[PDB]
Structure 1
Amino acid sequence: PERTFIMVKPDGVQRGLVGEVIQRFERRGYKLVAIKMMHASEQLLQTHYEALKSLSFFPKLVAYMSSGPVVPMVFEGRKVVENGRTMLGATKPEASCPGSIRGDYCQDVGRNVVHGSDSTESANREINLWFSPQELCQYKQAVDPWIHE
């Protein structure tokens, strides 16, 4: 069961885009299995972005990502990691195509509304960092026979 970690950033919350992000995944048949709103601590954010810890903008990113609530969530379905990346669009909004989240809503790489896992290994790490196993819900989608072979 492929899963990906999606997270609305503080600017996505402020601009009222939480439902929009969820709905883009639901409309593609993906199964919401976990979600919550929280203030993320600096330590959690530093671990989440550990691959970037050596970059100049790391402290600014961490301080920004803790400056208002975020909405982490988990979606499940076929090719959800790769399709999640396409649906979010390029990291830099000016490189993203219309129809993607960042192409429709963003103008600045530093205010690009949403985070999504870039690989299966990253998804598994991020899911387990933000959610305990008991927060992940299991159910069978009624439309399952019509969304994949």
Structure 2
Amino acid sequence: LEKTFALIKPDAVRAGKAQEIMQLIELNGFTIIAKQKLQLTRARAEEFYGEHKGKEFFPKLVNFMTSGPIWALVLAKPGAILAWRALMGPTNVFKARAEQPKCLRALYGTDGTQNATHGSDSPISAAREIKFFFPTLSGDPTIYAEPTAAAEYITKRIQPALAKALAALAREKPSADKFEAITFVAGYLLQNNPNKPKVLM
């Protein structure tokens, strides 16, 4: 059982074809574990399409994805990535109509870049995009729980501020009650951190 990312572009939404696509997706054995209708801004779209970053089609591609609300879906299936790649069919809409009819790109997609769907290529990009659009959707418990990778992540996170917080806790030595120490270290962390700034009125 694997989870892939997918999104319905504004061309299949301005034509009111989103629900038909969702029903077709559910008919082929997929499961929509998470869905959200949203509207990307220019900066968010540019950050999402980082792999292209200045290619020939990038201007029109980023100008199109911010022309209306899209849908974002997380599909779940044993062969989700490959099966969804097949279900969408070939990227080029005219080549899709020629080769494989009765595919979502052939039916709903038109006019080249407006292929009416977007899917993930590999599990790396799938996980990256899922975390991009669903920050709180749990997943991938095997690629983060390696003792080497766990130690590496703890190393990346602790030197910035937690070591300093522990040093301050040891030097100040507040009430021996552990709850006060927990509160003090939490305040120190939420006050001193390299990622977020300090907020003042």
TM-score, normalising length: structure 2:
0.63
Answer yes or no: is the 8 Å Cα contact 2:131–2:137 preserved in 1.
no
* 1:37-56 correspondence to structure 2 within 5 Å: 37-56=37-56
Taking CA–CA contacts closer than 8 Å with sequence separation of 6 or more, which of the two structures ends up with the larger relative contact order?
1
Aligned length in residues: 136
SS at structure 2 position matched to 1:36? strand
Residue deviations 1:61-120, cap 9 Å, x none? Answer: 112111110111101111111111111111111111112101122231222111111121
Where does residue 143 of structure 1 map in the other structure?
Answer: none
Whether 2:60 is the aligned partner of 1:60: answer: yes
Deviates more, 1:73-82 or 1:99-108: 99-108
Instruction: Report the RMSD for the aligned CA atoms in angstroms.
Output: 1.6
Question: Quick one: distance in 1 between partners of 2:138 and 2:22?
Answer: 17
Where does residue 2 of structure 1 map in the other structure?
Answer: 2
Question: Quick one: distance in 1 between partners of 2:10 and 2:111?
Answer: 14
Whether 2:114 is the aligned partner of 1:111: answer: yes
Answer yes or no: is the 8 Å Cα contact 2:5–2:75 preserved in 1.
yes
Whether 2:103 is the aligned partner of 1:133: answer: no
Answer yes or no: is the 8 Å Cα contact 1:34–1:135 preserved in 2.
no
Question: Quick one: distance in 2 between partners of 1:38 and 1:85?
Answer: 23
Answer yes or no: is the 8 Å Cα contact 2:35–2:74 preserved in 1.
yes
TM-score, normalising length: structure 1:
0.84
Residue deviations 1:14-71, cap 9 Å, x none? Answer: 1111112212221112111111111111222112211111212212211211111011
Where does residue 193 of structure 2 map in the other structure?
Answer: none
Question: Quick one: distance in 2 between partners of 1:66 and 1:4?
Answer: 22
In structure 2, runs of 5+ residues without a counterpart are 140-201
Question: Quick one: distance in 2 between partners of 1:63 and 1:82?
Answer: 28
Question: Quick one: distance in 1 between partners of 2:25 and 2:123?
Answer: 17
Question: Quick one: distance in 2 between partners of 1:66 and 1:18?
Answer: 17
Where does residue 16 of structure 1 map in the other structure?
Answer: 16
- Identical residues among aligned pairs (%): 33
Looking at CA atoms only, which structure, 1 or 2, has the larger radius of gyration?
Answer: 2
Moved over 3 A (4+): none
Question: Quick one: distance in 2 between partners of 1:120 and 1:89?
Answer: 18
* 1:81-96 correspondence to structure 2 within 5 Å: 81-96=81-96
